[PDB]
From Swiss-Prot, chains A, B:
This is Protein-arginine deiminase type-2. Its cofactor is Ca(2+). Detected in keratinocytes in epidermis (at protein level). Keywords: Calcium, Cytoplasm, Hydrolase, Metal-binding. Its main location: cytoplasm. It is an enzyme of class 3 (hydrolase).
């Protein structure tokens, strides 16, 4: 970077030189009128070139060489090392008229060289490298660079800042800046609600870290210490990317020169680092489970025993939560979503919370904020996929919606915008609005195929249920009763025959199968799936006044997936030879693939099933091995 | 694109098939309970494959082949041509039990194949190609594709739509859609203020074009005509890219299926085209001049004669405007900016207008909308440059501002955001706030170097002026008077001596030279310029109470550039040997390069110069040869 510094007519100019730049110096303006030629001397650590009309020649420390004074003949001044107290760094120019060889005047330039660099870990190894050339930009991908910031999801201490990103101002120079200079760190007003920066202002009084840049604070004067010095700063993001915010923020340091009272200080030198705030990322069912969170009323005993029995088959831990006055029966599933953030140095799980009425341990970050489509039961994410050559290494988020011209329900714009702005999960809208409750988790899920890197999409299917019931009826099982053991269902005496003879229910369910198939098609298209990747599980629905579906028997597709082990809601289907024909059919689909099924009874405690489930579960999983910053998202 | 269509248990399914998709067909659900195997027949133009566990085999129109009924054995159905009235396109499946070879039941699929494609010119040759595979995306660069929309900068006629982009819905099929289908064109609520679409609703009553999509209209049912048909639509952009709007809009067509009253129609098929609205682009001084616009009071005769004499040296035309009650003296320069838009089919010049108090021919588009930094005298644009390997083929926009921590003036956020959002001119902020008026055009300009592809940056320089005056004084010209012929200046008797002896003015101008040099450095950095690319023109300023500069004599850098011919404000400098020493110095810098200087007197009519200019000029230029859509802007 070339910088303009002029000799001043009949006077000495003193200037700070910042390493990494060089000066072009006009010597012609300072020349007395009538002067013909000039000569120059310079000190040991200043390099001087005479540049005439583009041709540059190096000049010795003390020569007698003379050049013609011309506007197009200038100096180029370079220094390779910072000044110390033993430096006298200078360039002196003498001027001659046509008569004598004795100088008629002279103009000097006295320099103080310092190194100033604002450093960040832009190469993403967790360590702050010296002056990364790319630190002022942010690029995606394996070869991409630029520094990463975590949102802080919780006078300050040193230990409390462990989760933040380091930024170090490295300097080198003599004992003091020359008179009239100061060093200032600053951010834009716009970024002031995106970021915060801490540092110890008075280190001789302690380690106390104070907040010097952020809301209401746009600049901070930093104190210069001579010799080689580093000032350590810690930087936090205040918010995730969103509709109006790309995720990118900038921090600047400038050397400012005092001009005079009432006049602004001049930015002699400025160094800039850029940060991207790490996006919130969701974990699909194929990722290794860590903890299983469940919520149920205190007395649903079968549910708790059977869930505990399931988790004990695995290496997961169980966390049991009970119901709250301000939260729904399903709140652990509907009001909470487990996701994570990651920076090169650190990452942690981060929970999104949307309490029904408003307001899990210290290891978590917590992000807290309308129709039923706003619930997190309506939010899923696929395993990693490749679609038409385009890879989605973190998978794609799935959100239930209604047809564009339908005038039906849709997730709120704020949440939709938030998910889109994370960019790395490239969300897809499905059609959930044919369901009374309206959640994609009522009709679909994903399971890994054990012993491989592959996965299956599981889809609810009414056609599968009707085919099975018609077979069993043909086999002479038409009188087989459902809901055995639910006393509140008994007076209904629902059998396979009674179900198959109900004409309006048949038509309702043909319609719901169209709804499911429309989703099947979008899923195959947007996830790059074929029919080989999909298994259909029998389901059945009843229609409400709005022509929307609610489960006739518990939806088995919404299941706890812990690797090979699947907790599947107990369907209470018709009993053939003292086994539920629905459980037996599902085992026959899944077990040959190495998946182990355990049916979990969440409804017996209520004596009947009206289409609503009173328990919920959510699984916290390990993050992807693939680093998000290695992705190359499409330009938005 | 694969689409799910199921045979229905004991009944015929009728469906529309859209060319470019194919169907996967479950035959197993429709099978009676107890059925073992199936066989199939199909018509001539339907292709059928039996796909079992992934293995697909083609099946003849009438064979006797049987396959085992399995959930994993399905059909794949394909058609290569649209149905006509002579078509009977069908697939019939028969079912057998274990006993007989006579079918126990059958389920059919009756198809009507149509072609539906929403076509745009996505390959950017001005003609609408059939179904461009990339029409649903928009990519920059030489190899980039996707369609371009012009902002409309002005019942409808056919001729009035000449400036819009064409979009054609191409269909092929039999005389009518089967019962319960309709075709609908639609846009999102969000895009509804970005776009508008016209078309003739009732062609049998005339050619009258009506507005069917846009503000308040999100969808339009289009009438289906049989045979090969095209419906022609015209599309206009309503606004330029801006802070919240990328410039991209989408238009959809869907085939919708009627389900039943009270239930939404199902989107059977959807085709999407994307448009980018063309950005507003500025023209730098190197582009060929077309018209020169000037404004002055009616009686400034010297100004008009000399400007006319200048333009007559060129092939440009002169347009003379006079002053208005609602506009400043300089309004043609300050309140108006000439730029252009371009699409493959058409482009036109587009003027930005910001009248001082609020509110050029039919060939122009007109875009109409605070401190002096908001004026267009504060807006410039560089010739094409390459900086550190990064090319800016349309140059870069330059905007004057104040230092970040200064608390000084800045152009309004709205205008700044607008310029940034055009993206193709990648704007740069300079420092203009040291000037009372605060316009970059007071201190800098660009000129081509005749006979080459190169250009120069011209910078005002106070150091150049002082050097020249000190020489002339040394030569014995110290008593040479300025402002000769301005009667209102006479009593001041300003000479070279009086100027050079004024100590505070010397210090003020050293300070202003620092301000100019700070700009020089940013310009060199952001435009990739060296000292070889820059010429310094003498200037001089006086300081006001705010420590800001106003011209002491007319700023020569703000000049009319028509190729080799430069209209330069007459400086009224000191007379040496009956020539202005400022005019002679400037000729000596410029003329050797082939630039022809004509000095234009805009101040004599006022009898004195206080730092304000009462005339203005603006030049309309030919657009760049380089097409904007060929650029590859940095991802924002
Ligand atoms: Ca590093
Ligand atoms: Ca969820
Ligand atoms: Ca074309
Ligand atoms: Ca302008």
């Amino acid at each position: 970077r070339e910088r303009t510094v002029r000799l001043q007519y009949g006077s000495r100019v003193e200037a700070v030189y910042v390493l990494g730049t060089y000066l072009w110096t006009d010597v012609y303006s300072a020349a007395p009128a009538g002067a013909q030629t000039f000569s120059l001397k310079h000190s040991e650590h200043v390099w001087v070139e005479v540049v005439r009309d583009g041709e540059a020649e190096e000049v010795a420390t003390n020569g007698k060489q003379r050049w013609l004074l011309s506007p197009s003949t200038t100096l180029r001044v370079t220094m390779s090392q910072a000044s110390t107290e033993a430096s006298s760094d200078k360039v002196t120019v003498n001027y001659y008229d046509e008569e004598g060889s004795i100088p008629i005047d002279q103009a000097g330039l006295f320099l103080t060289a310092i190194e100033i660099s604002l450093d960040v870990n832009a190469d993403r190894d967790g360590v702050v490298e010296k002056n990364n050339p790319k630190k002022a930009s942010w690029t995606w991908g394996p070869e991409g660079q630029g520094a990463i910031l975590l949102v802080n999801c919780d006078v300050y201490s040193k230990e409390d800042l462990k989760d933040m990103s380091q930024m170090i101002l490295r300097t080198k120079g003599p004992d003091r800046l020359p008179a009239g200079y100061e060093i200032v760190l600053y951010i834009s007003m716009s970024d002031s609600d995106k970021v915060g920066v801490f540092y110890v202002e008075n280190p001789f009084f302690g380690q106390r870290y104070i907040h010097i840049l952020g809301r209401r604070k746009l600049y901070h004067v930093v104190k210069y210490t001579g010799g080689s010095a580093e000032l350590l700063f810690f930087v936090e993001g205040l918010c995730f990317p969103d509709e109006g915010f790309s995720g990118l923020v900038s921090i600047h340091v400038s050397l400012l020169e005092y001009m005079a009272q009432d006049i602004p200080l001049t930015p002699i030198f400025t160094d800039t680092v850029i940060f991207r705030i790490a996006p919130w990322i969701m974990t699909p069912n194929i990722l290794p489970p860590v903890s299983v969170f469940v919520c149920c009323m205190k007395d649903n005993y079968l549910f708790l025993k059977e869930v505990k029995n399931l988790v004990e088959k695995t290496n997961c831990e169980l966390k049991v939560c009970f119901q709250y006055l301000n939260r729904g029966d399903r709140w652990i599933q509907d009001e909470i979503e487990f996701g994570y953030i990651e920076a090169p140095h650190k990452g942690f799980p981060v929970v999104l919370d949307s309490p029904r009425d408003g307001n899990l341990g210290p290891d978590f970050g917590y992000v807290t904020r309308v129709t039923s489509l706003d619930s997190f039961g309506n939010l899923e994410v696929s395993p990693p996929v490749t679609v038409n050559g385009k890879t989605y290494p973190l998978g794609r988020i799935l959100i239930g919606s209604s047809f564009p011209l339908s005038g039906g329900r849709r997730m709120t714009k704020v949440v939709r915008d938030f998910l889109k702005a994370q960019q790395v999960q490239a969300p897809v809208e499905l059609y959930s609005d044919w369901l009374t409750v309206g959640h994609v988790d009522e009709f679909m899920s994903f399971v890994p195929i054990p012993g491989t890197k592959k996965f299956l999409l599981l889809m609810a299917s009414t056609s599968a249920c009707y085919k099975l019931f018609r077979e069993k009826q043909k086999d002479g099982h038409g009188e087989a009763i459902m809901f055995k053991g639910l006393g509140g269902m008994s007076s209904k005496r629902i059998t396979i025959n009674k179900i198959l003879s109900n004409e309006s229910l048949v038509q309702e369910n043909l319609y719901f199968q169209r709804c499911l198939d429309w989703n099947r098609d979008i899923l195959k298209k947007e996830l790059g799936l074929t029919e080989q990747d999909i298994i259909d599980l029998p389901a059945l629905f009843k229609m409400d006044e709005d022509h929307r579906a609610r489960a006739f028997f518990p939806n088995m597709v919404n299941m706890i997936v812990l690797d090979k082990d699947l907790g599947i809601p107990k369907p209470f289907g018709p009993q053939v030879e003292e086994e539920c024909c629905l459980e037996m059919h599902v085992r026959g689909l899944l077990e040959p693939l190495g998946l182990e099924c355990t049916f979990i009874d969440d409804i017996s405690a209520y004596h009947k099933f009206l289409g609503e489930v009173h328990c919920g579960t959510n699984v916290r999983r390990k993050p992807f091995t693939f680093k998000w910053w290695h992705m190359v998202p499409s330009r938005r």
